[PDB]
């Protein structure tokens, strides 16, 4: 299977699945940027910093491969809005569960503002590798 990607947006700092790439441009400065179309509107995003390989769901049977200090894309639901953004695992309370669903609790620290939330596996994706 081929590489899929996600891009970070300058509007909200959240990551969105990239559908396709349209063109590119070089800045006076030398930074390279890329015009990205999102799946589901259109943006210039820095290649080095704001585009990476798509995060990957964790299945309950493999919840053990998530550790502290791991970087994860987290579904951060609030008021109304819901953003997928980066946080790091600070701590894990492992639960008693089978392959069907994971009741482990992952305390994450969101990178942007250092706020803290407790998430289920269902609201986190790991990074490749
Ligand atoms: O590249 C900058 C940093 O992040 C990397 O991940 C990112 C990396 O940033 C970025 O350059 C690289 O961009 C690849 C973006 C894909 C460009 C687009 C692809 C479809 C059509 C061709 C053009 O993606 C890496 C993942 O392949 C690496 O994880 C990191 O080591 C590296 O320093
Ligand atoms: Zn688990």
Curated annotation (Swiss-Prot):
Q: Where is this region: SAWADEE domain?
A: 14-116
Q: Which domain of life is it from?
A: Eukaryota
Give me the residues that bind Zn(2+), please. 63, 97, 102, 104
Main location class:
nucleus
Question: What happens when you mutate residue 104 to A?
Answer: Decreased stability of the protein
Output the Gene Ontology terms for molecular function: chromatin binding; metal ion binding
Q: What is the effect of changing residue 84 to A?
A: DNA methylation defects
Report keywords, A-Z: Metal-binding, Nucleus, Zinc
Disrupted-gene phenotype: Loss of DRM2 controlled DNA methylation, but no effect on CMT3 or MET1 controlled methylation.
Quote the annotated effect of residue 38 to A: Loss of interaction with H3K9 and strong DNA methylation defects
GO cellular component: a single term: nucleus
Q: Does the keyword Metal-binding apply?
A: yes
Query: Does the keyword Nucleus feature in the UniProt annotation?
Result: yes
Q: What is known of its domains?
A: The SAWADEE domain (138-244) binds to mono-, di-, or trimethylated H3K9 histone peptides, but this interaction is impaired if H3K4me2/3 methylation is present.
Tell me the subunit arrangement. Answer: Associates with the RNA polymerase IV (Pol IV) complex. Interacts with NRPD1, NRPD2, NRPD3, NRPD3B, CLSY1 and CLSY2.
Something else the entry says is:
Associates in vivo with Pol IV but not with Pol V and this interaction is not dependent on its H3K9me binding activity.
Q: What does this protein do?
A: Involved in RNA-directed DNA methylation (RdDM). Required for the silencing of some endogenous RdDM targets and accumulation of 24-nt siRNAs, but not for the production of Pol V-dependent transcripts. Functions in transcriptional silencing through both DNA methylation-dependent and -independent pathways. Required for both maintenance and de-novo DNA methylation. Plays a role in the recruitment of Pol IV to genomic regions associated with K9 methylated histone H3 that are targets for RdDM.
Please identify the protein, giving its name as recorded. Answer: Protein SAWADEE HOMEODOMAIN HOMOLOG 1
Gene designation per UniProt: SHH1
Where the shown chain sits in the full protein? Answer: 125 to 257 of 258
